[PDB]
Short mmCIF file of N, CA and C in Angstrom, two decimals:
data_model
loop_
_atom_site.label_atom_id
_atom_site.label_comp_id
_atom_site.label_asym_id
_atom_site.label_seq_id
_atom_site.Cartn_x
_atom_site.Cartn_y
_atom_site.Cartn_z
N UNK A 1 -12.68 42.48 44.72
CA UNK A 1 -12.88 41.04 44.69
C UNK A 1 -14.04 40.71 43.79
N UNK A 2 -15.21 41.27 44.09
CA UNK A 2 -16.42 40.98 43.32
C UNK A 2 -16.25 41.34 41.86
N UNK A 3 -15.55 42.43 41.59
CA UNK A 3 -15.23 42.75 40.22
C UNK A 3 -14.50 41.60 39.55
N UNK A 4 -13.50 41.05 40.25
CA UNK A 4 -12.78 39.92 39.68
C UNK A 4 -13.63 38.65 39.68
N UNK A 5 -14.41 38.39 40.74
CA UNK A 5 -15.28 37.21 40.80
C UNK A 5 -16.18 37.18 39.58
N UNK A 6 -16.96 38.24 39.42
CA UNK A 6 -17.88 38.35 38.31
C UNK A 6 -17.13 38.23 36.99
N UNK A 7 -15.94 38.82 36.93
CA UNK A 7 -15.12 38.67 35.75
C UNK A 7 -14.68 37.24 35.51
N UNK A 8 -14.56 36.46 36.59
CA UNK A 8 -14.19 35.05 36.45
C UNK A 8 -15.38 34.22 36.03
N UNK A 9 -16.57 34.61 36.46
CA UNK A 9 -17.78 33.94 36.00
C UNK A 9 -17.94 34.14 34.50
N UNK A 10 -17.81 35.39 34.06
CA UNK A 10 -17.86 35.66 32.62
C UNK A 10 -16.63 35.10 31.92
N UNK A 11 -15.53 34.90 32.65
CA UNK A 11 -14.36 34.27 32.07
C UNK A 11 -14.64 32.81 31.77
N UNK A 12 -15.23 32.12 32.74
CA UNK A 12 -15.62 30.74 32.53
C UNK A 12 -16.58 30.64 31.37
N UNK A 13 -17.56 31.54 31.35
CA UNK A 13 -18.47 31.63 30.22
C UNK A 13 -17.72 31.75 28.90
N UNK A 14 -16.81 32.72 28.81
CA UNK A 14 -16.10 32.97 27.56
C UNK A 14 -15.25 31.77 27.17
N UNK A 15 -14.66 31.09 28.15
CA UNK A 15 -13.79 29.97 27.84
C UNK A 15 -14.60 28.77 27.38
N UNK A 16 -15.74 28.53 28.02
CA UNK A 16 -16.63 27.48 27.56
C UNK A 16 -17.09 27.76 26.14
N UNK A 17 -17.36 29.03 25.85
CA UNK A 17 -17.72 29.42 24.50
C UNK A 17 -16.57 29.15 23.54
N UNK A 18 -15.34 29.46 23.99
CA UNK A 18 -14.15 29.04 23.26
C UNK A 18 -14.20 27.57 22.92
N UNK A 19 -14.51 26.75 23.92
CA UNK A 19 -14.56 25.31 23.72
C UNK A 19 -15.60 24.95 22.69
N UNK A 20 -16.75 25.62 22.74
CA UNK A 20 -17.80 25.32 21.78
C UNK A 20 -17.33 25.57 20.37
N UNK A 21 -16.66 26.70 20.16
CA UNK A 21 -16.05 26.99 18.87
C UNK A 21 -15.08 25.89 18.48
N UNK A 22 -14.20 25.54 19.42
CA UNK A 22 -13.16 24.55 19.16
C UNK A 22 -13.79 23.26 18.68
N UNK A 23 -14.68 22.69 19.49
CA UNK A 23 -15.25 21.39 19.18
C UNK A 23 -16.06 21.42 17.90
N UNK A 24 -16.67 22.55 17.59
CA UNK A 24 -17.32 22.70 16.29
C UNK A 24 -16.31 22.46 15.18
N UNK A 25 -15.27 23.29 15.16
CA UNK A 25 -14.27 23.17 14.11
C UNK A 25 -13.59 21.81 14.15
N UNK A 26 -13.39 21.29 15.35
CA UNK A 26 -12.76 20.00 15.57
C UNK A 26 -13.53 18.90 14.86
N UNK A 27 -14.82 18.77 15.16
CA UNK A 27 -15.61 17.73 14.54
C UNK A 27 -15.66 17.90 13.04
N UNK A 28 -15.71 19.15 12.59
CA UNK A 28 -15.71 19.41 11.16
C UNK A 28 -14.42 18.92 10.52
N UNK A 29 -13.29 19.17 11.16
CA UNK A 29 -12.00 18.74 10.63
C UNK A 29 -11.85 17.24 10.72
N UNK A 30 -12.47 16.62 11.72
CA UNK A 30 -12.48 15.16 11.78
C UNK A 30 -13.20 14.59 10.58
N UNK A 31 -14.34 15.17 10.22
CA UNK A 31 -15.05 14.70 9.05
C UNK A 31 -14.25 14.96 7.78
N UNK A 32 -13.65 16.15 7.69
CA UNK A 32 -12.77 16.47 6.57
C UNK A 32 -11.72 15.39 6.43
N UNK A 33 -11.10 15.05 7.55
CA UNK A 33 -10.06 14.05 7.56
C UNK A 33 -10.57 12.72 7.05
N UNK A 34 -11.74 12.31 7.53
CA UNK A 34 -12.33 11.05 7.08
C UNK A 34 -12.51 11.06 5.57
N UNK A 35 -12.97 12.20 5.03
CA UNK A 35 -13.04 12.33 3.59
C UNK A 35 -11.68 12.09 2.99
N UNK A 36 -10.66 12.75 3.53
CA UNK A 36 -9.32 12.64 2.96
C UNK A 36 -8.82 11.21 2.98
N UNK A 37 -9.23 10.42 3.97
CA UNK A 37 -8.95 9.00 3.92
C UNK A 37 -9.60 8.38 2.69
N UNK A 38 -10.87 8.71 2.45
CA UNK A 38 -11.51 8.20 1.25
C UNK A 38 -10.79 8.68 0.01
N UNK A 39 -10.33 9.92 0.03
CA UNK A 39 -9.62 10.46 -1.11
C UNK A 39 -8.42 9.60 -1.41
N UNK A 40 -7.60 9.31 -0.40
CA UNK A 40 -6.40 8.53 -0.66
C UNK A 40 -6.76 7.13 -1.14
N UNK A 41 -7.86 6.57 -0.65
CA UNK A 41 -8.34 5.33 -1.26
C UNK A 41 -8.52 5.52 -2.75
N UNK A 42 -9.13 6.65 -3.11
CA UNK A 42 -9.36 6.94 -4.51
C UNK A 42 -8.10 7.36 -5.23
N UNK A 43 -7.05 7.75 -4.50
CA UNK A 43 -5.77 8.02 -5.13
C UNK A 43 -5.11 6.71 -5.50
N UNK A 44 -5.13 5.76 -4.58
CA UNK A 44 -4.50 4.48 -4.85
C UNK A 44 -5.25 3.75 -5.95
N UNK A 45 -6.57 3.85 -5.96
CA UNK A 45 -7.30 3.39 -7.14
C UNK A 45 -6.95 4.24 -8.34
N UNK A 46 -6.73 5.54 -8.13
CA UNK A 46 -6.32 6.46 -9.18
C UNK A 46 -4.84 6.40 -9.45
N UNK A 47 -4.21 5.34 -8.97
CA UNK A 47 -3.12 4.76 -9.70
C UNK A 47 -3.55 4.03 -10.94
N UNK A 48 -4.85 4.11 -11.32
CA UNK A 48 -5.36 3.59 -12.58
C UNK A 48 -5.39 2.07 -12.53
N UNK A 49 -5.24 1.53 -11.32
CA UNK A 49 -4.77 0.16 -11.14
C UNK A 49 -3.64 -0.08 -12.12
N UNK A 50 -2.67 0.84 -12.08
CA UNK A 50 -1.61 0.79 -13.05
C UNK A 50 -1.98 1.41 -14.37
N UNK A 51 -2.39 0.55 -15.31
CA UNK A 51 -3.02 0.98 -16.55
C UNK A 51 -4.38 0.34 -16.75
N UNK B 1 3.24 2.41 -24.17
CA UNK B 1 2.07 2.03 -23.36
C UNK B 1 2.47 1.14 -22.18
N UNK B 2 3.52 1.53 -21.46
CA UNK B 2 4.10 0.69 -20.40
C UNK B 2 3.04 0.13 -19.47
N UNK B 3 2.98 -1.20 -19.37
CA UNK B 3 1.94 -1.85 -18.58
C UNK B 3 2.30 -1.68 -17.11
N UNK B 4 2.09 -0.45 -16.63
CA UNK B 4 2.39 -0.09 -15.25
C UNK B 4 1.35 -0.72 -14.35
N UNK B 5 1.77 -1.18 -13.16
CA UNK B 5 0.87 -1.55 -12.05
C UNK B 5 1.32 -0.81 -10.79
N UNK B 6 0.61 0.26 -10.44
CA UNK B 6 0.77 0.93 -9.14
C UNK B 6 0.13 0.05 -8.09
N UNK B 7 0.96 -0.48 -7.20
CA UNK B 7 0.50 -1.30 -6.10
C UNK B 7 0.75 -0.63 -4.76
N UNK B 8 1.98 -0.19 -4.51
CA UNK B 8 2.32 0.28 -3.18
C UNK B 8 1.53 1.51 -2.79
N UNK B 9 1.12 1.54 -1.53
CA UNK B 9 0.40 2.70 -1.01
C UNK B 9 1.24 3.96 -1.08
N UNK B 10 2.56 3.81 -1.14
CA UNK B 10 3.48 4.92 -1.28
C UNK B 10 3.73 5.22 -2.76
N UNK B 11 4.11 6.46 -3.02
CA UNK B 11 4.29 6.92 -4.39
C UNK B 11 5.44 6.20 -5.08
N UNK B 12 5.32 6.07 -6.40
CA UNK B 12 6.28 5.47 -7.32
C UNK B 12 6.35 3.95 -7.20
N UNK B 13 5.63 3.34 -6.27
CA UNK B 13 5.72 1.91 -6.06
C UNK B 13 4.99 1.17 -7.16
N UNK B 14 5.58 1.14 -8.35
CA UNK B 14 4.93 0.64 -9.54
C UNK B 14 5.70 -0.52 -10.15
N UNK B 15 4.96 -1.34 -10.87
CA UNK B 15 5.51 -2.47 -11.59
C UNK B 15 5.40 -2.22 -13.08
N UNK B 16 6.50 -2.46 -13.80
CA UNK B 16 6.57 -2.25 -15.25
C UNK B 16 6.54 -3.60 -15.95
N UNK B 17 5.54 -3.81 -16.80
CA UNK B 17 5.33 -5.08 -17.50
C UNK B 17 5.30 -4.83 -19.00
N UNK B 18 5.64 -5.87 -19.76
CA UNK B 18 5.72 -5.77 -21.21
C UNK B 18 4.86 -6.81 -21.92
N UNK B 19 4.04 -6.33 -22.84
CA UNK B 19 3.27 -7.12 -23.79
C UNK B 19 3.93 -6.92 -25.15
N UNK B 20 4.25 -8.01 -25.88
CA UNK B 20 4.63 -7.86 -27.28
C UNK B 20 4.17 -8.98 -28.21
N UNK B 21 3.42 -9.97 -27.74
CA UNK B 21 3.14 -11.13 -28.58
C UNK B 21 1.86 -10.92 -29.39
N UNK B 22 1.79 -11.64 -30.51
CA UNK B 22 0.63 -11.66 -31.40
C UNK B 22 0.91 -12.70 -32.47
N UNK B 23 -0.10 -12.95 -33.31
CA UNK B 23 0.05 -13.92 -34.38
C UNK B 23 1.16 -13.60 -35.35
N UNK B 24 1.35 -12.32 -35.65
CA UNK B 24 2.42 -11.92 -36.55
C UNK B 24 3.78 -11.88 -35.87
N UNK B 25 3.86 -12.21 -34.58
CA UNK B 25 5.10 -12.15 -33.81
C UNK B 25 5.65 -13.57 -33.64
N UNK B 26 6.56 -13.98 -34.54
CA UNK B 26 7.04 -15.36 -34.53
C UNK B 26 8.54 -15.55 -34.34
N UNK B 27 9.34 -15.24 -35.37
CA UNK B 27 10.80 -15.18 -35.19
C UNK B 27 11.15 -13.70 -35.15
N UNK B 28 11.24 -13.19 -33.94
CA UNK B 28 11.61 -11.81 -33.74
C UNK B 28 13.10 -11.66 -33.93
N UNK B 29 13.56 -11.72 -35.18
CA UNK B 29 14.98 -11.50 -35.46
C UNK B 29 15.40 -10.17 -34.84
N UNK B 30 14.68 -9.11 -35.17
CA UNK B 30 14.70 -7.81 -34.52
C UNK B 30 13.28 -7.27 -34.47
N UNK B 31 12.62 -7.43 -35.61
CA UNK B 31 11.23 -7.17 -35.89
C UNK B 31 10.80 -8.26 -36.87
N UNK B 32 9.66 -8.08 -37.51
CA UNK B 32 9.28 -9.00 -38.58
C UNK B 32 10.24 -8.81 -39.76
N UNK B 33 10.86 -9.90 -40.19
CA UNK B 33 11.79 -9.80 -41.31
C UNK B 33 11.02 -9.55 -42.60
N UNK B 34 10.15 -10.49 -42.96
CA UNK B 34 9.39 -10.40 -44.18
C UNK B 34 8.58 -11.66 -44.40
N UNK B 35 8.69 -12.24 -45.60
CA UNK B 35 8.04 -13.52 -45.85
C UNK B 35 8.51 -14.57 -44.86
N UNK B 36 9.76 -14.46 -44.41
CA UNK B 36 10.28 -15.30 -43.37
C UNK B 36 10.18 -14.57 -42.05
N UNK B 37 10.37 -15.31 -40.97
CA UNK B 37 10.56 -14.85 -39.60
C UNK B 37 9.31 -14.31 -38.91
N UNK B 38 8.33 -13.84 -39.67
CA UNK B 38 7.02 -13.51 -39.13
C UNK B 38 5.90 -14.09 -39.98
N UNK B 39 5.97 -13.86 -41.29
CA UNK B 39 4.85 -14.17 -42.16
C UNK B 39 4.74 -15.64 -42.48
N UNK B 40 5.72 -16.46 -42.13
CA UNK B 40 5.41 -17.87 -42.14
C UNK B 40 4.38 -18.19 -41.08
N UNK B 41 4.41 -17.46 -39.97
CA UNK B 41 3.35 -17.62 -38.99
C UNK B 41 2.04 -17.08 -39.52
N UNK B 42 2.10 -16.02 -40.31
CA UNK B 42 0.89 -15.42 -40.85
C UNK B 42 0.51 -16.11 -42.16
N UNK B 43 1.39 -16.02 -43.15
CA UNK B 43 1.04 -16.45 -44.50
C UNK B 43 1.31 -17.93 -44.76
N UNK B 44 2.18 -18.57 -43.96
CA UNK B 44 2.43 -20.00 -44.12
C UNK B 44 3.05 -20.36 -45.48
N UNK B 45 4.33 -20.06 -45.64
CA UNK B 45 5.06 -20.25 -46.90
C UNK B 45 4.93 -21.64 -47.53
N UNK B 46 4.52 -22.67 -46.80
CA UNK B 46 4.44 -24.03 -47.34
C UNK B 46 3.16 -24.17 -48.16
N UNK B 47 3.24 -23.76 -49.43
CA UNK B 47 2.09 -23.83 -50.33
C UNK B 47 2.37 -24.81 -51.46
N UNK B 48 3.21 -24.38 -52.40
CA UNK B 48 3.85 -25.20 -53.40
C UNK B 48 5.31 -24.84 -53.55
N UNK B 49 5.70 -23.63 -53.12
CA UNK B 49 7.10 -23.25 -53.02
C UNK B 49 7.88 -24.30 -52.25
N UNK B 50 7.25 -24.93 -51.26
CA UNK B 50 7.94 -26.00 -50.54
C UNK B 50 8.26 -27.16 -51.45
N UNK B 51 7.29 -27.59 -52.26
CA UNK B 51 7.54 -28.72 -53.14
C UNK B 51 8.65 -28.40 -54.13
#
């Protein structure tokens, strides 16, 4: 039991650490995405306003 | 030099416009004929040849 208990404590630890990794990459990709919104703004302008 | 106007946020959503006018562009028979059809606008044949 205690072997598993302690393993579950370290499991919770490892999973929370998983979450930390996730949210790191998550926020980074959110910012990336926001850039890409700006990019498409610049694409539509980089329709040259036509000519 | 197609006077394109990219407007639509989606691709290919463009407007094609045409410029062709100018002082030498008067009677566009097909193009400028010569002393007539364009160059009366430019050179003004009514000098003394008219008399």
